[PDB]
Amino acid sequence: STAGKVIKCKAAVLWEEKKPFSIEEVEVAPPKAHEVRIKMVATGICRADDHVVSGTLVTPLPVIAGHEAAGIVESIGEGVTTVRPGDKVIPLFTPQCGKCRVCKHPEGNFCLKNDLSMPRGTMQDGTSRFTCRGKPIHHFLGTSTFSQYTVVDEISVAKIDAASPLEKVCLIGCGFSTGYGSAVKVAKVTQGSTCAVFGLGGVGLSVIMGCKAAGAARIIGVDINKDKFAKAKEVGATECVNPQDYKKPIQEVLTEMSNGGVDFSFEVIGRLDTMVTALSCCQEAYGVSVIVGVPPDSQNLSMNPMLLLSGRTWKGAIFGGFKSKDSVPKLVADFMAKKFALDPLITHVLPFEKINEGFDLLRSGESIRTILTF
Amino acid sequence: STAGKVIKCKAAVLWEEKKPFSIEEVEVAPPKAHEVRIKMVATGICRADDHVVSGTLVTPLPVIAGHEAAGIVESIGEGVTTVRPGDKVIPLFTPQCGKCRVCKHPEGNFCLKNDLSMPRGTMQDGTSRFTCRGKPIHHFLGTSTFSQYTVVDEISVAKIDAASPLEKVCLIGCGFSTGYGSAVKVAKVTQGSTCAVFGLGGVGLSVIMGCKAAGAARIIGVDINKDKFAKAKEVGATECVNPQDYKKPIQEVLTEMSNGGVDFSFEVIGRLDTMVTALSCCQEAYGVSVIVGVPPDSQNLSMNPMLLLSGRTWKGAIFGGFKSKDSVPKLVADFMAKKFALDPLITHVLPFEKINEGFDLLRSGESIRTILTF
Numbered sequence A, B: 001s002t003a004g005k006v007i008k009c010k011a012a013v014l015w016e017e018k019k020p021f022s023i024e025e026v027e028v029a030p031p032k033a034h035e036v037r038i039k040m041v042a043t044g045i046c047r048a049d050d051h052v053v054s055g056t057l058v059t060p061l062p063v064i065a066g067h068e069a070a071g072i073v074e075s076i077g078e079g080v081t082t083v084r085p086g087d088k089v090i091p092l093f094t095p096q097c098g099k100c101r102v103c104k105h106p107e108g109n110f111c112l113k114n115d116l117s118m119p120r121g122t123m124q125d126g127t128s129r130f131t132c133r134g135k136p137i138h139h140f141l142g143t144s145t146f147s148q149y150t151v152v153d154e155i156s157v158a159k160i161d162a163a164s165p166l167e168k169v170c171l172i173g174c175g176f177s178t179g180y181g182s183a184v185k186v187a188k189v190t191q192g193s194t195c196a197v198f199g200l201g202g203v204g205l206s207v208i209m210g211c212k213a214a215g216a217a218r219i220i221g222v223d224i225n226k227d228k229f230a231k232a233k234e235v236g237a238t239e240c241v242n243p244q245d246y247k248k249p250i251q252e253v254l255t256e257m258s259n260g261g262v263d264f265s266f267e268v269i270g271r272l273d274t275m276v277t278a279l280s281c282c283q284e285a286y287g288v289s290v291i292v293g294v295p296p297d298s299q300n301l302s303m304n305p306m307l308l309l310s311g312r313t314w315k316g317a318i319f320g321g322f323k324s325k326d327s328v329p330k331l332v333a334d335f336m337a338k339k340f341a342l343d344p345l346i347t348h349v350l351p352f353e354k355i356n357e358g359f360d361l362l363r364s365g366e367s368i369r370t371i372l373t374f
């Protein structure tokens, strides 16, 4: 009834940076070749969506943001083979094209046909499928989920289990998979190790879940907001430190606590001071430090190269190092087999028309994750 | 007629900074508990020994430097259950105590008993076995090979095969296994990969040899001294670039050459700007950059943490990551099973006395190694 026809629906347009999302009528063009139109069911509010608003993340505007989501395929374009109308899918803000040198590499997952490095805010072919108030409107990371209907390229969508509870597994689109992957696939946390997690937000809690799944002996959570401590021990943190409670700098504190340094340290905040600090607190001969948080744009850190030269490893990752197309289905299937929980991360559920309340709730620090439902 | 008895011999004493070595009669003391005294046969002249003259490396003075050597044991103290008078040994500037947190780790090698973090110029008991002109002379990294006889601790020495040539295998004591180990053990160069090696001195050539043995398909050597390209190509470099020759930054050049980045990059110079350059020229999603060169005292580098967030890995190491007491005896039999050559590294052979000319050589930049013969 709608296949091949323009669809009119509501979307949260961001006309300019640091303002309010405006629920407006939009036209959604039908999918062209190797494109997929999806009817959204639930979308999460992630810190990266706020960075677009605050200007912390530069992407062309006006934009339809959002990138944690689950939806139902409404129609598929010419040549699509991997999904089907009626299929449950999750958009992938990191594509997996299967052809470039990164997709061929056994480990790397930053596919070269992504929209992170040099955001164009368009589809793969360079156009836009969104028109509102007569004019055209930009995409976000090739996903754009803050809309009732969206169009994504086939390389940016993964089919999942048809029984999945869509309104919970949308976290696998970013928040959970990122933190969980940073532990088990990027840092490759070893059993019996000691871990330090800087940041007890949604992503940081998922790091802890990863560390625990890897069987870490001790998992120390670090956050200046002590209210985030309860949830952290809930999901596996063995102890929690507030750096404000200590006279010494925190890397010193964590070094003493761990008898000379932690085996794995995770920066899950997005600050340059805590990146250098996370690296310092891991053991000098073979600590591993993973950067998960995204710093403010175009801005360098200072660090002493001596920290690395004694044996430290310093690495970072997008989307927890997971090849998206490949890993999202397997992650959903592990959730269906109850191999990990996602309820502890969901603190607020709001109808989609309340997107601005969900965002005001993120800047408040109250939420871990707010889910918008359509 | 030497055991337990004080020995007099010639030794290269460094009385202060920025001065020529002074070959003098010294009093080498007897081995105490768990110590070993060694008569030297051949010793190398590495950059680190020169950094002690200038000030690029602080350690107490007067000192008997030198850390790359081979000799034979003459006598041993009480508790020595690992070597015997007359067997060939190589002193290790990185000890392997076998009891500390690092020595028991599967991967670490920066043993906590070193004298690198807080150099202190003594044996492990805090005293000195060297006396010259009546005054106690400090040690250097627990080795001190610029003397005809020396006393090291048991943890700072490994027995090698009894038929090995001591005018060649001494480079396993530093130069070779540092560079070689950085490729094969630290980076773990995968076979079929593209490598970029910054700096084509003694250590850099060793990195290159590690890259070939690892099965690398392309090995690009980077140096501003185009006189080093011949050896580089002789021992494995497929290509050599001089950054002075190009109108563009060298990492742009290397990114084009490698079609978007190298798999592994190595900084074997010791400069802050080439460290972030080497990191940048390796593939943004799965590249690995190993720091081997040692920078000047203090002086923090500045870098964009976005280089790591996309998937890069950045690490450094001491002694190529080799656990010293274990690896050294192995790497010698390797040379004894002819798994690799050490001829192209040794360029100048001087009698020990004329030590200074060897440094003049080194500062000249005219050589790879120079071996001093006893």
Ligand SMILES: NC(=O)C1=CN([C@@H]2O[C@H](COP(=O)(O)OP(=O)(O)OC[C@H]3O[C@@H](n4cnc5c(N)ncnc54)[C@H](O)[C@@H]3O)[C@@H](O)[C@H]2O)C=CC1
Pocket (backbone or CB within 6 Å): A046, A047, A048, A174, A175, A178, A198, A199, A200, A201, A202, A203, A204, A222, A223, A224, A225, A228, A268, A269, A270, A271, A274, A291, A292, A293, A294, A317, A318, A319, A320, A368, B309
């Ligand atoms: N590399 C990737 O692929 C991804 C990166 N991210 C980034 O992960 C980071 C964390 O994400 P969320 O948990 O959702 O954000 P969040 O704001 O909910 O969590 C941040 C936590 O860090 C705490 N914190 C703030 N300053 C601190 C300080 N000086 N010291 C210690 N703790 C401090 C805060 O109290 C807060 O609890 C974000 O920067 C996000 O952009 C998001 C997902 C994927």
Ligand SMILES: NC(=O)C1=CN([C@@H]2O[C@H](COP(=O)(O)OP(=O)(O)OC[C@H]3O[C@@H](n4cnc5c(N)ncnc54)[C@H](O)[C@@H]3O)[C@@H](O)[C@H]2O)C=CC1
Pocket (backbone or CB within 6 Å): A309, B046, B047, B048, B174, B175, B178, B198, B199, B200, B201, B202, B203, B204, B222, B223, B224, B225, B228, B243, B268, B269, B270, B271, B274, B291, B292, B293, B294, B295, B317, B318, B319, B320, B367, B368
């Ligand atoms: N991490 C560890 O365990 C150890 C570290 N090292 C360090 O390795 C480094 C190199 O060792 P060597 O080969 O013996 O010294 P070297 O002086 O023979 O080699 C340095 C090379 O770098 C070249 N170079 C200088 N500036 C350059 C620039 N801007 N761009 C490109 N090339 C440049 C020079 O032409 C020179 O050939 C030293 O800094 C040494 O302290 C040495 C032994 C062990």
Ligand SMILES: O=CNC1CCCCC1
Pocket (backbone or CB within 6 Å): A046, A048, A093, A116, A174, A294, A318, A319
């Ligand atoms: O949080 C989701 N995506 C992020 C990944 C890191 C760069 C900014 C966008």
Ligand SMILES: O=CNC1CCCCC1
Pocket (backbone or CB within 6 Å): B046, B048, B057, B067, B093, B116, B174, B294, B318, B319
């Ligand atoms: O070259 C030998 N030893 C080096 C090891 C790294 C720090 C400086 C001294």
Ligand SMILES: [Co+2]
Pocket (backbone or CB within 6 Å): A046, A047, A048, A049, A067, A068, A174, A175
């Ligand atoms: Co996100």
Ligand SMILES: [Co+2]
Pocket (backbone or CB within 6 Å): B046, B047, B048, B049, B067, B068, B174, B175
């Ligand atoms: Co050396």
Ligand SMILES: [Zn+2]
Pocket (backbone or CB within 6 Å): A095, A096, A097, A098, A099, A100, A101, A102, A103, A110, A111, A112, A113
């Ligand atoms: Zn790809």
Ligand SMILES: [Zn+2]
Pocket (backbone or CB within 6 Å): B095, B096, B097, B098, B099, B100, B101, B102, B103, B111, B112, B113
């Ligand atoms: Zn040890």
